[PDB]
Design a binder for these strands. Sequence first.
RNA 1: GGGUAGUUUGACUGGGGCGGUCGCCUCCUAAAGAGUAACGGAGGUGCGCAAAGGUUACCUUAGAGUGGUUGGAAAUCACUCUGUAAGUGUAAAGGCAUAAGGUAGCUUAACUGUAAGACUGACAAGUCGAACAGAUACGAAAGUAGGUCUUAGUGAUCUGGC
RNA 2: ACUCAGUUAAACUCCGAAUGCUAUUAAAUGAUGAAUAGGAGUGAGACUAUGGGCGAUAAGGUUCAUAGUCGAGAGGGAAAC
RNA 3: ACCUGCGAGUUAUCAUGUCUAGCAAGAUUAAAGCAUAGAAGUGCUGGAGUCGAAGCGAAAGCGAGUCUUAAAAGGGCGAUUU
Lengths: 51, 66, 74, 100
Amino acid sequence: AVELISLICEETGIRNYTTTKNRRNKQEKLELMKYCPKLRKHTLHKEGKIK
Amino acid sequence: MANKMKTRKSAKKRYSFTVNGKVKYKKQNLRHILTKKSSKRKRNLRKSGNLSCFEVKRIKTLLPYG
Amino acid sequence: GSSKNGRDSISKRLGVKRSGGQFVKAGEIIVRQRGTKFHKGKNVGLGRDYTIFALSSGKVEFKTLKGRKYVSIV
Amino acid sequence: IKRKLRLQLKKARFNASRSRSKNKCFIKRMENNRKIISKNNINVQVFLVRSLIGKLNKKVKVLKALGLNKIGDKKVHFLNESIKGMLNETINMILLSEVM
RNA sequence: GGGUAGUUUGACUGGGGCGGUCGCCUCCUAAAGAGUAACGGAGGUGCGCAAAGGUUACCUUAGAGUGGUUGGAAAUCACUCUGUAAGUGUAAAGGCAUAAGGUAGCUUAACUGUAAGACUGACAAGUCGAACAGAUACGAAAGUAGGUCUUAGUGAUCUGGC
RNA sequence: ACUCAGUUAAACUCCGAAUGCUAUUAAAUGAUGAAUAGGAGUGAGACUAUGGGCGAUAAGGUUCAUAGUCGAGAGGGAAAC
RNA sequence: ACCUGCGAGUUAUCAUGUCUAGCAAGAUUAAAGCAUAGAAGUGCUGGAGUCGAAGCGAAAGCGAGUCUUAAAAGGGCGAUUU
């Protein structure tokens, strides 16, 4: 009941990070302030698919 | 020419020789499931390494020309 | 009726790596341990797994205070 | 007769067949050696009188550090704490005489 | 589609077979560095957690005795003695009063490029790491934060997909 | 439960050796250390003196730790061994 | 069974190490040709090719530096002392 999700930089769309998240516990759309190395600046990353 | 020693191709495709003996190679475990592995572990696995001096003689036998 | 058990882990090689009075340089590992069997004193640091390491060159020393052992670099 | 018992018995008889005269000679030698070692800062001559074969590894290393490799080995040494400790370790295999 | 052909069907094992077992973690065996066998003696495990993480600030149980509607030996509250035996997602050990225990606010460092110097080690691997640059989080600041108190929660190469 | 007295524990320790391990210095012992290059063989051990586990504080039994011997060692002694 | 004979790490090439001989930042020719000889030679001709002389990086590419990177900021592999 745990899936591998990918955190995507909002303003570039690059899949910068991958992480684990438990489905059937929140089924929300996890957002995380992560550092986007393309921009040398922190920004918002959203949950998304892997494949 | 009748009997030139054949190189071991599967070894050629993985080993490299430095100028004065050492052998360069690519580290393992950075090919596959990667989410769980820590970032510093992955960063160290990316950078290439040198083999221990104990394998160099066998490798020099495997790569007779390279 | 065979044996119900027989299972052991790999030995982890803990213990004191540099003896008291030895000369170490910066970054040396002094103790490997689970938990603060030895606590940190002057000029040493504690890793995330309670390893004791030397922040500067010097000579290791162990002191005892209230029954607890402290490691320092002097 | 059972082999366990006869081996025990044969070994016990060999061990017990030692001569008190030889033991007294050994005791006299030990007393002399201890008396000499009790001194301090003298030149002492060390003879090796028992072989190195079969002895403990540590003691063989001590004897080779003193300089004796064979029976009949002669070495003069100046008694300080180090030599005194080595002689005490290997007292049973040496003969100490004093160099006037 | 055994009509016919080419092959596979493991090892350890107090003979073999049957049975049981094969990764990893904790303790003893283990003889006071480390290491050290067995079909030796006992357990857990192929996770969970968007908080049970990070930071700042503020606090301490369990048990014995005594007094209280349900309430009795024991639920909740007050006090005395006791001073960690309580509690630390999950097994056990080593640790934890400065608490690593508990509560609350903010927050995402559960970062990127890196790394002097090491431990463990046949090799391949694994682990600790001051400190540097960028971008932050928290705090007044010094500083801390490169997940989880630490020690199991894992799988090479080749091939293929995004 | 509490008090006094007396006991058991490899997986209990309020305490804790003797040895061993590690560092420094001074002596002592003379190619025993380390590195590189070339070339192997070995990866079936056994016994004794100690510390052990398993077995039945039985076995020339099984499996670990220290040292020696045989292995690869002639000679003398333990009647032969 | 005895005795006497026969009866097993060789040859051809490649890699690498050492020894010997020679040259030297260069060393060396292979196939093949000519001449003489009839003497399956050995004296020339023949430099196509190979190994050194620069490495690093997946490569492009750059070069006593190169790659990892905004960074010689630290290291990895080099070298200036062949």
